[PDB]
Structure 1
Amino acid sequence: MVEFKILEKRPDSIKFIVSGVDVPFANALRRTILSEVPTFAVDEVEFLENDSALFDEIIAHRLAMIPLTTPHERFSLDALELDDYTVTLSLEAEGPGMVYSGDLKSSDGDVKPANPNIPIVKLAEGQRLTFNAYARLGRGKDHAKWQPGFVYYKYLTKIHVSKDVPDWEELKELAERRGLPVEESDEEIVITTIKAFYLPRKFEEHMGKGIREEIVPGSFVFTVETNGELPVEEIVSIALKILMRKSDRFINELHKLAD
């Protein structure tokens, strides 16, 4: 009786309701996405030349933070022990001009900047920049550079507003204005919080009387954005596979206690 309802797909992002689960599982899904789902990211940079205005260390950080396409069809991204495969992203540039992510040349076409338009560093005339940047699989829990995106989640709820509440009409109007479902009866309006609702200060006094927010048990609204390493739906799939792999391996380790 677990169900997903996909509500909205937007650039690099998705909003869905998951039902028939619970708070620990919702917490675990969010954490797994942020902390465990792996990506390729620049991890080490060998500079050969840098005549730019910036430190090696600053350029290396900017390279680390470029989202790299991560080929989930090639590498097992739910693996507990990640493939140590290293990709070389190289640059050999001379000013004048801006160096962009798109100027990086990859040893492996499957792993390169998802966005070619990210400015890295401007070079003046005569200034050279030459390096080999080494990208590897890693996890957000190790360094932010490997985190695949961002996760926002909330209880699915119904906000009940009694028509005894003066100007309840403003709350129906606000909900409609922001695309929240509203059901209207003789007694009340009911607002489904597929997004956060911001109760105007005017109505705070009515909380606990005329206005009540009721959680829908077992249902949660997730909003997920990818940085571009992975499609947002694949991020979710990988996270769920990771929980299967972890639990399976833990059972195997438990059996060794028996012995």
Structure 2
Amino acid sequence: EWNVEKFKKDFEVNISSLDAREANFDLINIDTSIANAFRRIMISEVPSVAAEYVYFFNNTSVIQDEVLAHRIGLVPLKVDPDMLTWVDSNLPDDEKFTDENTIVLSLNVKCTRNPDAPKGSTDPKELYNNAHVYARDLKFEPQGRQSTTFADCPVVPADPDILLAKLRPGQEISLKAHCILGIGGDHAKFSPVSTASYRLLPQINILQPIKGESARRFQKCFPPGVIGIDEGSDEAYVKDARKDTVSREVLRYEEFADKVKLGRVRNHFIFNVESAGAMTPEEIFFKSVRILKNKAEYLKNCPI
């Protein structure tokens, strides 16, 4: 029999680490059907803000315009996706981009030759002026009422050293960029996650005891934190079944084809969520279980 209180007893979360970008945590006694449903939302269906419409006024640089527009779209933008709503595509361009739907970014950079460069120089940062265009040169321009709600936090890119273009004197780039929401099923630039995936917990099952000098070679055929030898008797045991990459190195040696088997704990998942910069990995997983709850809630209320 299954019940929502039977699941509430057996499920628990075992969080390993936190960081501003990466979170390592565990889900115990949950199905593969649900644990896949969480990582399929974190890649595809959790919103993020990225540049979609780029408005070139002048581009005399070497990299052409649709490629340089494509690179601005791949720049992660450190902005909270809750601060602005969705666009309506059927509206015309006069009425579609409002200040509650759209953040404006501008890039105005001109390159000129530096006459104060030393003789025989090779470094283009000294031989030229504004020779490299970075992601921090995308200046935020608040329009309308978002000069107050973004005065506490401007729209800076999450990685300000992203090299957008390279220029030589005489050349320039001048553009505007309207960045909106979107999901990772639309384009890859809206996925707020570097990677989000699980590995199941390996289960190293020592069948027969490996006492003796074969316990230094059985220990060698794993990552170093996986197998330790016992002190009271010389005996290899499992210290941590998490640290192993499942390499099956013991199956190459005919000595260990009877004494160990490599299974897998079928419900102990290890999520590894790495944020692209816009949100915390705490918040992406928290949204992804809220998206699946609202997704079933939408079908529950729609008429059949």
Q: TM-score range by the shorter chain?
A: 0.7 to 0.9
Q: Give ranges in structure 2 of 5+ residues lacking alignment.
A: 1-9, 87-97, 112-128, 143-149
Question: SS of the counterpart of 2:30?
Answer: coil
Aligned residues: 249
2:104 match: 88
TM-score by length of 1: 0.84
* Partner of residue 137 from structure 1, selected from 161, 181, 202: 181
Conserved 8 A contact 2:228-2:236: no
The equivalent residue for 2:141 is 107
Question: Structure 1: 5+ residue runs without aligned partners?
Answer: 78-82
Structure 1 residue 151 corresponds to structure 2 residue 199: no
- Distance 1:171-1:151 versus aligned 2 partners, 3 A rule: farther
- Cα gap change, 1:67 to 1:171, in 2 (>3 Å): farther
CA–CA distance in structure 2, aligned partners of residues 188 and 66 of structure 1: 49
1:170 is aligned to 2:179? no
Distance 1:62 1:39 in 2: 16
Report whether the alignment pairs 1:246 with 2:295.
yes
- Partner Cα separation in structure 2 for residue 194 and residue 242 of structure 1: 31
Greater strand content: 1
Tell me the TM-score normalized by structure 2: 0.73
Tell me the C-alpha RMSD between the 2 structures. 2.8
186 and 203 in structure 1: CA distance in 2 versus 1, 3 angstrom threshold: farther
Greater alpha carbon shift after TM alignment, 1-10 vs 22-31: 1-10
Question: For residue 16 of structure 1, what is the aligned residue in structure 2?
Answer: 25
Matches within 5 A, 1:27-46: 27-46=36-55
CA deviations over 1:10-53 (Å, ceiling 9, x no partner) = 56212211112110011101101011011100111010010101
> Is the Cα–Cα contact under 8 Å of residues 47 and 56 in structure 1 kept in the other structure?
yes
Larger Rg: 2
State the shift of 1:194 in Å.
4.6
Amino acid at match of 2:287: I
Map of 2:122 onto structure 1: none
Contact 1:182 1:189 in 2 (8 A): yes
SS at match of 1:192: coil
